[PDB]
Design a protein around this ligand. Structure first.
Ligand SMILES: Nc1ncnc2c1ncn2[C@@H]1O[C@H](COP(=O)(O)OP(=O)(O)O)[C@@H](O)[C@H]1O
Ligand SMILES: CN(CC(=O)O)C(=N)N
Ligand SMILES: [Mg+2]
Lengths: 376, 376
């Protein structure tokens, strides 16, 4: 109806001015593609203008190119595939429209990874996101859908016991004390301040139906209705990535089984893996990483390059840890789609091991050139 | 609340005794203005008492006229504008509340200054400072904020390349000899001995989250978290001020670009230019100068007159808190607001040549007074 009104205007009159923009959406949205897709709509009523709104509002930057678009439901990726495919291929370094994504949530396929030198790895974690099929994604979901998702999530999470026994914390009723504890634990999320997220409409009705759940041992954490229906995180001190990944896989499996009993399932397909709001999170939507002490390597000229070759990413940290050590970094896999969860965790395990060997060499004041890896 | 307690005492009982003080703050702070602004506070909690403490604690300075107050966050200049505006006007030769700041980082607009006499100018340097919006300034920032700033600065600076490729050296990671070596060679900020630094609260937690980043040749350097979040410096031996300035403009613009790509912006506004801790560093926050041998002029009557005439300030060989040794004076532009960066460097280039002229004649007994220029 509203779209019907826009259709009365020539396509070029509604076409966004992206002359100063720098995001994936802007790169692919040609005057032709816009005229071609602007009349389309998903069953929930999500249109091309809805998909690209955030990319129009947020120009992005030359160096850091943002995605500039979001899916509003599972059908968005199909209906507007001519937009998403090029963006997906570009963002995930060559992932073709015909490629297949393999999912592997079997910890036993992981080789080693249970002994990352604790003298360097302070903590390990693996996180992902999931969408419940049948409901619209955060940018487009109604208060009703969101509340239904929250109910489904809470039921399941409250059924978990033993190692995964825990409790739910609704943001709405959260006390100052709970809020602080969660903040000290790095388990809290607030209303997004990022315009990329705000412009998509995902922050509507905040904090209605949003919540945080974590097990009593504080090694398993779930965020409900934030960027995606569910955000799942497994973590713990030390470098036992295998243990962290095992809890990750077990937790996801149990939750899924709980959903299936009520006839619900995660959004997933052979091409895009698990479906999520932002194209950059498709496939495994998995980020496996470690907080690692690398005071020597961190100050080395080829640090960023080595990470790149190992297909890893880094971020500095701002805690007392890096202050005392003089170089603690948050390192994780860079890939998301076209690699299974196992292969992704494997690259972090393998990558970290080499990082540690280099750090030790540097400690001894030796060279690390012979240890340099080739781009993987 | 502490301020609430103090508000229980009449304003006259809390009013500081500035009878033996000689700083800009002292020239403006009246009992009336104090009573009017003492109940105010910024979102961060910075109060008038916090703003003026250093000026109450420090009646004067052995080498320069001091401001006597500091800003604790970007909002300080607005909430306490009735204090700052008069000071800013006095410190920056008449800059009024209605005036506008102009920027000009175009090296090409600088004429000459590429060959200041090497027999006089030992080295040329151009520096400025930048504040990251959203964080409190050094007088008030928490250990957490300061650590966050260092984190952001290190990741950004690690992207510079070419002649600007560099490395970060955390203060806490240098040996005692390494730190003093950099200080004595005029590259690193001195130890927290400054009277302003101590009294304003900027020495807290030292040396936590403080450090210096610089390229291989140490011709482009960045101080992290000293008196300002960032102090960008370009320097080299000799008198080729133009090359120093060109490198300065280049590096500076790349730095801003890198921060923008991360959704961060420097504190700035049309009126005050770039926002820094000390009002004396507003606008361009630029201090361009040379280390110059002037044994004659140094011990001359109207030397301070020629400098005040040329809008130039003199400092010791080791900085503002030091005296000139071996006849080597630090001569730089005095004002920073109301003039563009190019105009500022131009005044230093033109000024130096007049200084060398006066020197060349004083060394020939031809004590000249005709060279005396008109105050610009
Ligand atoms: N022209 C110059 N050449 C070399 N070193 C300089 C020059 N100017 C300043 N320095 C050095 O910079 C340091 C800081 O001095 P200060 O007076 O505080 O300057 P600023 O405020 O600009 O940083 C000192 O160590 C000083 O020796
Ligand atoms: C107090 N000072 C010195 C300084 O800020 O470094 C002034 N320039 N007013
Ligand atoms: Mg200084």
């Amino acid at each position: 109806s509203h779209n019907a009104l826009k259709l009365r205007f020539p396509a070029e009159d509604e076409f966004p001015d992206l002359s100063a923009h720098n995001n994936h959406m802007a790169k692919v949205l040609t005057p032709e593609l816009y005229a071609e897709l602007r009349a389309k709509s998903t069953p929930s009523g999500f249109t091309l203008d809805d998909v690209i709104q955030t990319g129009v509002d947020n120009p992005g930057h030359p160096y850091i190119m943002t995605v500039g678009c979001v899916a509003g439901d599972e059908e968005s990726y199909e209906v507007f595939k001519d937009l998403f495919d090029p963006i997906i291929e570009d963002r995930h370094g060559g992932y073709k429209p015909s490629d297949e994504h393999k999912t592997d949530l079997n910890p036993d396929n992981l080789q080693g990874g249970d002994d990352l030198d604790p003298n360097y790895v302070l903590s390990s974690r693996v996180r992902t996101g999931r969408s419940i099929r049948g409901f619209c994604l955060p940018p487009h979901c109604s208060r009703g859908e969101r509340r239904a998702i929250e109910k489904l999530a809470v039921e399941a999470l409250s059924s978990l016991d033993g190692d995964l026994a825990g409790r739910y914390y609704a943001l709405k009723s959260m006390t100052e004390a709970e809020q602080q504890q969660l903040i000290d634990d790095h388990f809290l999320f607030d209303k997004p301040v990022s315009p990329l997220l705000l412009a998509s409409g995902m922050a509507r009705d905040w904090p209605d139906a949003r919540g945080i759940w974590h097990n009593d041992n504080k090694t398993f954490l779930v965020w409900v209705n934030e960027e995606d229906h569910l955000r799942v995180i497994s973590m713990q001190k030390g470098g036992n990535m295998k243990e962290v990944f095992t809890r990750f896989c077990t937790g996801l499996t149990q939750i899924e089984t709980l959903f299936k009993s009520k006839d619900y399932e995660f959004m997933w397909n052979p091409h895009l893996g698990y479906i999520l709001t932002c194209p950059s999170n498709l496939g495994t939507g998995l980020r496996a990483g470690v907080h690692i002490k690398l005071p020597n390597l961190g100050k080395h000229e080829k640090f960023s390059e080595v990470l790149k070759r190992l297909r890893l990413q880094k971020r500095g940290t701002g805690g007392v840890d890096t202050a005392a050590v003089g170089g603690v970094f948050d390192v994780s896999n860079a890939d998301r789609l076209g690699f299974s969860e196992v292969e992704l965790v494997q690259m972090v395990v393998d990558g970290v091991k080499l990082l540690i060997e280099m750090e030790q060499r540097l400690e001894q004041g030796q060279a690390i050139d012979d240890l340099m890896p080739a781009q993987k």
